[PDB]
Amino acid sequence: WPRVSPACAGRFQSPVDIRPQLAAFSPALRPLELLGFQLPPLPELRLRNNGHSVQLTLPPGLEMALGPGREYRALQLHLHWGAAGRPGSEHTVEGHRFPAEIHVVHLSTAFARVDEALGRPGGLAVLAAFLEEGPEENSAYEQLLSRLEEIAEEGSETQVPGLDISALLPSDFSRYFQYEGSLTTPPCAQGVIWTVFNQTVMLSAKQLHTLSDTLWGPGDSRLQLNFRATQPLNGRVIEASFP
Amino acid sequence: RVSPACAGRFQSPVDIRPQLAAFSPALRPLELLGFQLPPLPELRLRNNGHSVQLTLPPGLEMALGPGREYRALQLHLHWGAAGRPGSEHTVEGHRFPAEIHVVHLSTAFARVDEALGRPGGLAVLAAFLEEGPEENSAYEQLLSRLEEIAEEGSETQVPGLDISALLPSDFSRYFQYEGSLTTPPCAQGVIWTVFNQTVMLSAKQLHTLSDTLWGPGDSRLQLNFRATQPLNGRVIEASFP
Numbered sequence: 232w233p234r235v236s237p238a239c240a241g242r243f244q245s246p247v248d249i250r251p252q253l254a255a256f257s258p259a260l261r262p263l264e265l266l267g268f269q270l271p272p273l274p275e276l277r278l279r280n281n282g283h284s285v286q287l288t289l290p291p292g293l294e295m296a297l298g299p300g301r302e303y304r305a306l307q308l309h310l311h312w313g314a315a316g317r318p319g320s321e322h323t324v325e326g327h328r329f330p331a332e333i334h335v336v337h338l339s340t341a342f343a344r345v346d347e348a349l350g351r352p353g354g355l356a357v358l359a360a361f362l363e364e365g366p367e368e369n370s371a372y373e374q375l376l377s378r379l380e381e382i383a384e385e386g387s388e389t390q391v392p393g394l395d396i397s398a399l400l401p402s403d404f405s406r407y408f409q410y411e412g413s414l415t416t417p418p419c420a421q422g423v424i425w426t427v428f429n430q431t432v433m434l435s436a437k438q439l440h441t442l443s444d445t446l447w448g449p450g451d452s453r454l455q456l457n458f459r460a461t462q463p464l465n466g467r468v469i470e471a472s473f474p
Numbered sequence: 475r476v477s478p479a480c481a482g483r484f485q486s487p488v489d490i491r492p493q494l495a496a497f498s499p500a501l502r503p504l505e506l507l508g509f510q511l512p513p514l515p516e517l518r519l520r521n522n523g524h525s526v527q528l529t530l531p532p533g534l535e536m537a538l539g540p541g542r543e544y545r546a547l548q549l550h551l552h553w554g555a556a557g558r559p560g561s562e563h564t565v566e567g568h569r570f571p572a573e574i575h576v577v578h579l580s581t582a583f584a585r586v587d588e589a590l591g592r593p594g595g596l597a598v599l600a601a602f603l604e605e606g607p608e609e610n611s612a613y614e615q616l617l618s619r620l621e622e623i624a625e626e627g628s629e630t631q632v633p634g635l636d637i638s639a640l641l642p643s644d645f646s647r648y649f650q651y652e653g654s655l656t657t658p659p660c661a662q663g664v665i666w667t668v669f670n671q672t673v674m675l676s677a678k679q680l681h682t683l684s685d686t687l688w689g690p691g692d693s694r695l696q697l698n699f700r701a702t703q704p705l706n707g708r709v710i711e712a713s714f715p
């Protein structure tokens with residue numbers, strides 16, 4: 232990874248191990264504001280297998296705020312996962328790796344283009360939630376997972392009807408961890424604001440197997456364990472929106 | 475064009491109410507590197523008509539944390555008039571005699587105009603100036619030169635000095651909030667760090683600052699502070715409970 236682009240050996244990279252007892256509570260971290268995420272069924276959205284993950288391109292109008300006057304527009308979402316009987320979340324909590332992780336990537340409003348935001352502090356913000364095993368089938372996630380067989384091949388894509396993107400995220404928008412780090416693939420640009428929800432979302436064991444067993448990557452290898460290793464904080468302090 | 479960003483919701487200066495400040499233990503001591511200048515090359519001290527400014531050379535590096543790195547561009551002062559305070563920021567309604575600002579540019583940006591309006595592009599360090607019993611010698615190096623730049627738009631060269639000696643010793647205790655520039659264009663996204671500890675000048679020193687320079691026709695350069703702006707739901711953070 233430092234081979235093909237050396238930003239991946241920068242000092243302030245992601246993902247990181249979250250250690251709640253060492254997190255800094257700041258009352259200034261207000262609840263997350265997400266508007267325009269309840270999408271109608273038309274227009275349909277591009278759901279692509281890109282060889283390294285499954286991604287959903289998002290339209291313009293998904294407005295997000297991390298504070299007052301710190302606004303964002305959602306660009307896309309994608310997922311990280313493991314294999315049969317192996318977790319594949321990127322972030323860990325006290326060394327525990329969760330089954331999977333959703334990332335919703337956004338661009339700061341103050342930037343017109345993604346490539347101006349890269350490497351700039353707060354240019355990009357990601358919302359991250361952990362996916363766990365639960366008793367029920369998750370309806371929001373079945374909308375995406377049921378369509379995965381159709382894009383099993385590296386490079387293929389399909390169209391899915393619009394859905395409530397916020398339905399894919401956890402219950403409590405006032406409880407999260409926050410730090411500044413990087414993208415977790417090349418170019419590994421720094422200045423990315425990561426916000427990681429305290430609460431998880433639940434998927435059936437079948438859904439988690441659908442996600443981990445359906446997609447193929449590059450030759451004929453399985454698209455699995457698509458997570459970067461844990462990176463050192465190097466002096467950074469993870470903050471928390473709750474005592 | 476009466477400066478459209480000067481009507482933003484999130485402007486500076488503000489009234490700091492310590493009881494409404496949020497303690498955040500993420501806020502570590504500020505670190506400066508390269509503020510101790512050699513005497514040459516000299517720096518340009520300038521009466522720009524609205525303030526006195528010192529332009530700073532390249533290699534003054536400041537950090538607000540790990541990964542939050544800045545380069546110093548300039549400093550300038552805000553002050554009042556005989557018996558009237560002119561700090562920009564207030565604390566629980568109190569206006570201090572004067573204020574120093576050191577304006578910095580993020581090391582993601584090569585030019586000021588790329589940073590303006592961008593979150594965290596510019597960062598200012600701010601400290602209040604009060605009367606103390608002693609002549610402050612770092613300030614004296616600038617204040618003894620104000621007679622040479624009394625005229626609006628004049629300037630003079632001054633030996634490099636310890637720029638960090640114009641600031642308080644205690645870099646641990648401060649307030650921090652997101653706001654704006656206090657002159658047009660008043661662009662938002664500016665990280666303001668305001669020190670708990672103040673800097674001491676002699677009475678004579680403070681009088682020199684307030685009573686020596688002239689502004690735009692033949693009016694004295696005094697009371698060069700903007701009115702305090704509403705927080706408007708922003709929460710000022712504090713590095714200490």
Ligand SMILES: NS(=O)(=O)c1c(F)c(F)c(SCCc2ccc(C(=O)O)cc2)c(F)c1NC1CCCCCCCCCCC1
Pocket residue numbers: 279281283284286306307309334336345357413414415416417418
């Ligand atoms: N965790 S992460 O957000 O960093 C991330 C990952 F970790 C990933 F593994 C991935 S998947 C591997 C990179 C990739 C992306 C798209 C294509 C394609 O469409 O053909 C091919 C390869 C990812 F997209 C994202 N996110 C973004 C792409 C990362 C490259 C930077 C380009 C600017 C951001 C563009 C939108 C967000 C997607």
Ligand SMILES: NS(=O)(=O)c1c(F)c(F)c(SCCc2ccc(C(=O)O)cc2)c(F)c1NC1CCCCCCCCCCC1
Pocket residue numbers: 520522524525527547548550575577586598654655656657658659
């Ligand atoms: N508190 S503040 O930072 O907003 C500020 C003020 F409130 C001020 F009143 C002032 S003084 C009035 C603006 C000015 C600056 C320079 C000239 C000149 O050289 O001829 C003329 C007029 C100030 F300089 C600064 N700071 C200037 C220095 C930082 C470098 C330029 C960054 C671009 C923003 C342009 C506004 C001046 C900022």
Ligand SMILES: [Zn+2]
Pocket residue numbers: 309310311334415
């Ligand atoms: Zn990701």
Ligand SMILES: [Zn+2]
Pocket residue numbers: 550551552575656
């Ligand atoms: Zn100023």
